[PDB]
Amino acid sequence: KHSISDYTEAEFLQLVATICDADATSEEELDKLITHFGEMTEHPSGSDLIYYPEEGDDDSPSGIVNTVKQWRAANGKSGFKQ
Amino acid sequence: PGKATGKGKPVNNKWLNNAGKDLGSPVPDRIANKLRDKEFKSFDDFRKKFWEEVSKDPELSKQFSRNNNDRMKVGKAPKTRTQDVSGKRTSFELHAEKVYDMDNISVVTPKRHIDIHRGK
Ligand SMILES: [Zn+2]
């Protein structure tokens, strides 16, 4: 877990879907996760992407992953493994 | 074995927009209605059931995102925006102005909860 590029999409997904499941994680966990996910994404939005998603923005796990991956690309930062 | 009493207040459709200032946002009347038929075991049991009921009210649930309703369904408080975050305090807080009088309980952001107990 050093960068977004240590990750396979499938791998990142599972991470996101976990964040997004509230009986998956004690609250200190989620905390660690959420902090990882902002570090990984370098998205200015951070976890507003998770809980204050903008109007008509797919907020399922894949929907988030997707967004990260489309922003990250028009910024052209590094992407996922494979 | 804990009981809750109180009326709460009628609220709008931007319930927590005020949560930043003064003593925050009130317990909504319709939520209070439900919580007073219940029994609790701690202010912690009270908190979890408070969030629960919020998740179920048509007119409040509508003001939270899916992932937020998902927390509140199992009794965790909604995450704030990142800009109202402080330290490891990332979700909305209950503040008690003194067995649980909901007319002296409210909902605050972390940074406002901070200021309140450091006298600003
Ligand atoms: Zn307090």
Short mmCIF file of all heavy atoms in Angstrom, two decimals, chain B residues 95-96 113 117, ligand 1:
data_model
loop_
_atom_site.label_atom_id
_atom_site.label_comp_id
_atom_site.label_asym_id
_atom_site.label_seq_id
_atom_site.Cartn_x
_atom_site.Cartn_y
_atom_site.Cartn_z
N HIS B 95 -24.15 17.20 21.52
CA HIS B 95 -23.70 17.99 22.67
C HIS B 95 -24.86 18.10 23.68
O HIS B 95 -26.04 18.47 23.32
CB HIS B 95 -23.37 19.38 22.14
CG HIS B 95 -23.16 20.38 23.22
ND1 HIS B 95 -21.97 20.49 23.93
CD2 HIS B 95 -24.00 21.35 23.69
CE1 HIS B 95 -22.13 21.45 24.83
NE2 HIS B 95 -23.32 22.01 24.69
N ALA B 96 -24.54 17.85 24.93
CA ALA B 96 -25.48 18.02 26.01
C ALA B 96 -25.24 19.27 26.81
O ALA B 96 -24.22 19.43 27.43
CB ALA B 96 -25.49 16.85 26.89
N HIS B 113 -18.32 21.90 18.47
CA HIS B 113 -18.18 21.26 19.75
C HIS B 113 -16.93 21.67 20.52
O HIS B 113 -17.02 22.05 21.64
CB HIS B 113 -18.41 19.76 19.69
CG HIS B 113 -19.07 19.20 20.91
ND1 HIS B 113 -19.06 17.87 21.22
CD2 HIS B 113 -19.72 19.80 21.92
CE1 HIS B 113 -19.69 17.67 22.35
NE2 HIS B 113 -20.09 18.83 22.81
N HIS B 117 -17.02 23.98 24.31
CA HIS B 117 -16.41 23.65 25.61
C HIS B 117 -15.08 24.39 25.98
O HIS B 117 -14.42 24.00 26.93
CB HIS B 117 -16.18 22.15 25.78
CG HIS B 117 -17.43 21.33 25.73
ND1 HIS B 117 -17.91 20.61 26.81
CD2 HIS B 117 -18.30 21.10 24.72
CE1 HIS B 117 -19.00 19.95 26.45
NE2 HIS B 117 -19.25 20.23 25.18
ZN ZN C 1 -20.63 18.76 24.77
#
